[PDB]
Each structure stands twice: as C-alpha cells, then as structure tokens.
Amino acid sequence: NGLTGTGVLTESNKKFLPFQQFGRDIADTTDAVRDPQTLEILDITPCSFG
Amino acid sequence: KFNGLTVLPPLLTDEMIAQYTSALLAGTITSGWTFG
C-alpha cells in the first residue's frame, strides 16, 4: 500500500494499536507491517548478504 | 545490526583468554620471575 521495500516476510507476535499502519525501530528502518486484508501483523527481515 | 554494514567476530574467544590468564597466574604463583 505505497510502502516499498526488499526483504523476507515472516510472522510476528507484536501487537499493534487498532489504528497504526506500520512500525519501526530507528533510522527509518521498517520492522513490522500489517496486511490490510488479514489485519495481521507481519515482520520484515533483510535478505542475507556478506 | 544489518543495514549495509557487517561486524566480524574476534579471533580469540573468551575461554582462550581466560586460559592464558590462568596459566600466567599459576606460573607466577609457583615459579616467580624465573619462568619469564
């Protein structure tokens, strides 16, 4: 829904208040997005590199 | 911790350093300055 990024999706146990869209921790690093269809919180992990 | 940068682990683990310190301490208890 307009927020683009790259990574791997997974399930998350964090709980959102009924009005937020997506969370973050620091420095504009998205860490939790909820799909509008399911209203379930997901989680984003950067793809492995090295 | 992964945003475009990496952190490398140390070559010497903590256990090896503890073992070196124990060896030094036992040596200085028993022999003194002779083992240097």
Ligand SMILES: *[C@@H]1O[C@H](CO)[C@@H](O[C@@H]2O[C@H](CO)[C@@H](O)[C@H](O)[C@H]2NC(C)=O)[C@H](O)[C@H]1NC(C)=O
């Ligand atoms: C999207 O919205 C639809 C409603 O149009 C949801 O469909 C309902 O889902 C609940 C939960 O399983 C059911 O109890 C209802 O019977 C469903 N109603 C209809 C008309 O389908 C749907 O669950 C929502 N999410 C997705 C992913 O489709």
